Amino acid sequence: GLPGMQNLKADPEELFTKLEKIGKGSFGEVFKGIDNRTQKVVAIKIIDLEEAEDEIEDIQQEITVLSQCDSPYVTKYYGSYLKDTKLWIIMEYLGGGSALDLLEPGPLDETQIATILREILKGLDYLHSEKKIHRDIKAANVLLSEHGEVKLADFGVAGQLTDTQIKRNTFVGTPFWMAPEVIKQSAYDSKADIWSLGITAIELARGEPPHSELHPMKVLFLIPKNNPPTLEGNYSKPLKEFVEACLNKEPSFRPTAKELLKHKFILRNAKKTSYLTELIDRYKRWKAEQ
Numbered sequence: 485g486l487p488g489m490q491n492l493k494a495d496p497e498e499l500f501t502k503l504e505k506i507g508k509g510s511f512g513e514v515f516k517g518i519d520n521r522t523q524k525v526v527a528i529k530i531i532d533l534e535e536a537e538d539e540i541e542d543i544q545q546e547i548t549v550l551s552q553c554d555s556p557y558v559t560k561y562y563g564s565y566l567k568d569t570k571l572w573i574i575m576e577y578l579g580g581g582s583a584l585d586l587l588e589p590g591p592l593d594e595t596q597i598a599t600i601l602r603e604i605l606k607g608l609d610y611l612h613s614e615k616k617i618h619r620d621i622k623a624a625n626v627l628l629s630e631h632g633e634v635k636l637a638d639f640g641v642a643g644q645l646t647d648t649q650i651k652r653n654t655f656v657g658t659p660f661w662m663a664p665e666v667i668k669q670s671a672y673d674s675k676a677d678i679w680s681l682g683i684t685a686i687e688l689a690r691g692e693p694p695h696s697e698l699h700p701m702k703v704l705f706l707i708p709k710n711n712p713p714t715l716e717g718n719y720s721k722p723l724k725e726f727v728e729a730c731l732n733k734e735p736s737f738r739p740t741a742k743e744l745l746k747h748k749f750i751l752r753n754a755k756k757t758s759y760l761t762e763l764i765d766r767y768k769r770w771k772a773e774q
């Protein structure tokens with residue numbers, strides 16, 4: 485089965501206008517698109533099923549997890565279409581781009597950092613309450629609407645906890661952002677996302693994650709054997725402590741997403757999400773020059 489699968493007679497090439505590429509996901513390529521019936525903009529992930537082996541079950545899992553999410557903090561899923569050998573996965577388009585994109589004109593301030601982290605946490609609180617793990621939290625997978633709303637994206641490696649499986653142990657994620665227990669393939673749960681959030685916090689503060697100048701294969705020993713990273717530079721003590729709370733080698737010492745929503749860095753610095761429009765306006769003007 486495949487949740488949201490549409491009638492095969494429906495031609496997505498007729499129902500949507502495919503525009504420019506806006507990314508490359510864990511699976512397939514993603515395009516900006518127009519829904520021809522509503523004229524709303526969508527994001528379209530296209531996957532060639534023929535040149536895909538052992539990736540199709542992964543695709544099905546992504547669409548399943550996506551279709552089971554109903555939250556302001558998770559990109560919406562609008563269904564899937566088949567066009568010959570290609571699968572068109574229709575998703576909510578977020579006009580502000582990724583947090584990583586919004587970093588290109590220059591550093592964020594700590595109000596912006598706190599606000600983005602707060603909204604990521606609302607998303608993680610939702611997922612974790614649903615017994616889901618994202619497993620690929622990073623600034624590239626954090627999207628903003630053009631009104632400044634923040635949502636999680638790319639569920640390509642997301643995991644589901646059950647009653648018959650209270651922990652996962654699969655090796656998945658992006659190396660710089662992966663928790664030591666995931667790399668080591670110990671039994672892990674939602675706390676793995678909390679580690680990834682700490683790395684993402686550093687990324688949002690500094691522009692890059694720890695070890696970013698190294699070959700990804702080095703982190704397979706670097707992360708499990710070294711002391712966890714800390715945020716270095718001229719950042720507030722609350723922000724440095726937020727990061728340390730996340731980046732503890734012991735998963736049970738990491739706070740829950742729910743708890744982190746009350747962390748002093750968040751309460752003291754976060755403001756209305758609408759203010760993030762400035763960050764998006766900043767990017768547009770910057771891109772406008774070049």
Ligand SMILES: Nc1nc(Nc2ccc(S(N)(=O)=O)cc2)nn1C(=S)Nc1c(F)cccc1F
Nearest residue numbers: 506507508509514527576577578581585637638
């Ligand atoms: N749902 C969704 N909307 C957008 N919008 C978007 C993307 C890029 C840009 S930009 N800054 O002009 O290149 C602007 C808006 N991207 N997007 C997705 S799924 N992004 C995405 C992602 F989040 C992870 C991997 C690949 C991807 F293409």
